[PDB]
């Protein structure tokens, strides 16, 4: 049962879920309750799903259980401040998608898996980890007593899984660049139509990027510390690249760590600011994400001087 400070602060886009792991499941239950109703999931079925999801996240520095819940929380905040736009089913699916969207991640990029010749890259040639993440989600749903969608009709079940599939695939950031370009064209020609399912999928995709990247929308101390965990995986990957005989990109090369601030500038200019700029144009109540993103861009510019 949620303490008062969290009942309040959880509505803030910049909420941080804290260091107490055992609290995160109740945090997610509360979010899904508040967004989708307490009559919607069988409580002990949902609990069991949640613990099995936790168990199939790995102890990696960043792509871990904490990241998953944090991304779900960003989605909760977007959904709360955009009442009436998304269906019951969409809100259920998106929150579950966010919880599940990095299942069984190793802390390595699709590119590294492809260079390594990992079996997953043979099985899923594109969006490799993201296809696996969705595969893991289904496997967990098929375990005895884990079908949190058991009361929905067959049709609604296939529907919500497809919502989840597309949302998890969309977290492959390689897809974001084209998606966002399409959406910005749509916005500026006044052609964006939320009743159009393909447009709607794009908007959900962008929301999934926004949540996945949300470390850059927290207050600076959180953003800065989260970047330590992000780079710990990047640098581990570049070491691994060095071990296959391949010179890693700078971002993954620990020997170029003094360039981290310049790198952050690059990322904010080319990815984060455009992402939340476009999201605020479509969903104006998401503006606090953009403002916090800009403040962090200013902090990184401060570090450089
Ligand atoms: C919050 O920090 C980041 C989070 C990221 N999350 C997912 N993917 C990334 N990258 C994937 C490959 C390309 C990269 C990118 C794309 C466009 C411009 C810049 C970077 C995005 C990320 C890069 C980040 O900054 C790390 C930024 C960085 C870049 C270079 C050297 C040191 N740090
Ligand atoms: Mg991912
Ligand atoms: Zn993620």
Sorted by where each begins, the domain ranges of the chain are 1-305
Max distance between CA atoms of the chain, in angstroms, equals: 59
For helices 273-282 and 287-304, give the axis angle rounded to 10 degrees. Answer: 160
Do the annotations mark residue 33 as ligand-binding?
A: no
Do the annotations mark residue 104 as ligand-binding?
A: no
- CB count within 10 Å of CB 216 equals 26
Task: Look at residues 102, 79, 88 and name the one whose alpha carbon lies nearest to residue 10.
Answer: 79
What's the gap in Å between 61 CA and the centre of ligand 3? 12
Do the annotations mark residue 131 as ligand-binding?
A: no
What's the gap in Å between 189 CA and the centre of ligand 3? 31
Residue to mutate, 257, 271, 274, 304, ligand 1, most ligand atoms under 8 Å from C-beta = 271
For residues 195 and 51, give the distance between their C-alpha atoms in angstroms, rounded to a whole number: 36
Phi, psi dihedrals of residue 245, rounded to the nearest 5°: 95, 20
For residue 274, give the ligand nearest its CA: 1
The alpha carbon of residue 178 and the mean position of all alpha carbons in its chain are separated, in whole angstroms, by 18
**What Å resolution does this PDB entry report?**
1.8
Determine the straight-line distance between the first and last CA of the chain, rounded to whole angstroms.
Answer: 46
**1-305 classified as CATH 1.10.1300.10:** yes
For residue 72, give the ligand nearest its CA: 3
Would you list the DSSP string of 243-279?
HHT-PPPGGG-GGGGGGHHHHHHHHIIIIIHHHHHHH
Do the annotations mark residue 133 as ligand-binding?
A: no
- CB count within 10 Å of CB 188 equals 10
Indicate the SS3 state at residue 214: helix
For residue 107, give the ligand nearest its CA: 2
What's the gap in Å between 170 CA and the centre of ligand 2? 9
For residues 265 and 296, give the distance between their C-alpha atoms in angstroms, rounded to a whole number: 10
For residues 67 and 102, give the distance between their C-alpha atoms in angstroms, rounded to a whole number: 9
What angle (nearest 5°) sits at the alpha carbon of residue 264, between those of residues 258 and 266? 110
Q: Which atom of ligand 1 lies nearest, measured to the CA of 216?
A: 1
* Cβ within 8 Å of residue 222, ≥6 positions away: 14, 16, 215
For residues 95 and 88, give the distance between their C-alpha atoms in angstroms, rounded to a whole number: 11
The alpha carbon of residue 227 and the mean position of all alpha carbons in its chain are separated, in whole angstroms, by 15
What's the gap in Å between 38 CA and the centre of ligand 1? 39
213-217 contact pairs (CB < 8 A, 24+): 213/271, 213/272, 213/275, 214/13, 214/70, 214/71, 214/74, 214/289, 215/70, 216/268, 216/272, 216/292, 216/293, 216/296, 217/13, 217/14, 217/74, 217/276, 217/288, 217/289, 217/290, 217/292, 217/293, 217/296
Q: Which atom of ligand 1 lies nearest, measured to the CA of 226?
A: 1
For helices 65-80 and 24-36, give the axis angle rounded to 10 degrees. Answer: 20
For residues 145 and 51, give the distance between their C-alpha atoms in angstroms, rounded to a whole number: 12
Enzyme catalytic residues:
63
Residues 267 and 302: beta-carbon distance below 8 Å: no
Residues 94 and 167: beta-carbon distance below 8 Å: yes
Locate tokens 């989605």: which residue? Answer: 75
- CB count within 10 Å of CB 44 equals 9
Radius of gyration for the chain, computed over Cα atoms and rounded to the nearest angstrom: 19
Task: Look at residues 101, 111, 97, 8 and name the one whose alpha carbon lies nearest to residue 63.
Answer: 101
Tokens of 133: 């993440």
- In 233-266, which positions are buried (b, 16+ CB within 10 angstroms) versus exposed (e)? bbbbbbebbeeeeeebebbbbeebeeebeebbee
Q: Which atom of ligand 1 lies nearest, measured to the CA of 109?
A: 11
The alpha carbon of residue 259 and the mean position of all alpha carbons in its chain are separated, in whole angstroms, by 26
């Amino acid at each position: 049962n949620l303490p008062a400070r969290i009942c309040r602060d959880i509505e803030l886009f910049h909420f941080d879920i804290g260091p107490f792991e055992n609290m995160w499941p109740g945090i997610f239950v509360y979010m899904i309750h508040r967004s989708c109703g307490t009559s919607c999931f069988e409580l002990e079925k949902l609990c069991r799903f949640i613990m099995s999801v936790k168990k199939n996240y790995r102890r990696v520095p960043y792509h871990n259980w904490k990241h998953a819940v944090t991304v779900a929380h960003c989605m909760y905040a977007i959904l709360q401040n955009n009442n009436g736009l998304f269906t019951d089913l969409e809100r259920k699916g998106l929150l579950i998608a966010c919880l599940c969207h990095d299942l069984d991640h190793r802390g390595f990029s699709n590119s590294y898996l492809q260079k390594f010749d990992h079996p997953l890259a043979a099985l899923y040639s594109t969006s490799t980890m993201e296809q696996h993440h969705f595969s893991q989600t289904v496997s967990i749903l098929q375990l005895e007593g884990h079908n949190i969608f058991s009361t929905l009709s067959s049709s609604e079940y296939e529907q919500v899984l497809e919502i989840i599939r597309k949302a998890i695939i969309a977290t492959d950031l390689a897809l974001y660049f084209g998606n966002r370009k399409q959406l910005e064209e749509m916005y500026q020609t006044g052609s964006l139509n939320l009743h159009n399912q393909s447009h709607r999928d794009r908007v959900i995709g962008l929301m999934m990027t926004a949540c996945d990247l949300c470390s850059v929308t927290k207050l600076w101390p959180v953003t800065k510390l989260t970047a330590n965990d992000i780079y710990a995986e990047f640098w581990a990957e570049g070491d691994e690249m060095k071990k296959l005989g391949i010179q890693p990109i700078p971002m993954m090369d620990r020997d170029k760590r003094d360039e981290v601030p310049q790198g952050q500038l690059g990322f904010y200019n080319a990815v984060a600011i455009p992402c939340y700029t476009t999201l605020t144009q479509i969903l104006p109540p998401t503006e606090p994400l953009l403002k916090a993103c800009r403040d962090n861009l200013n902090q990184w510019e401060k570090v450089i001087r």
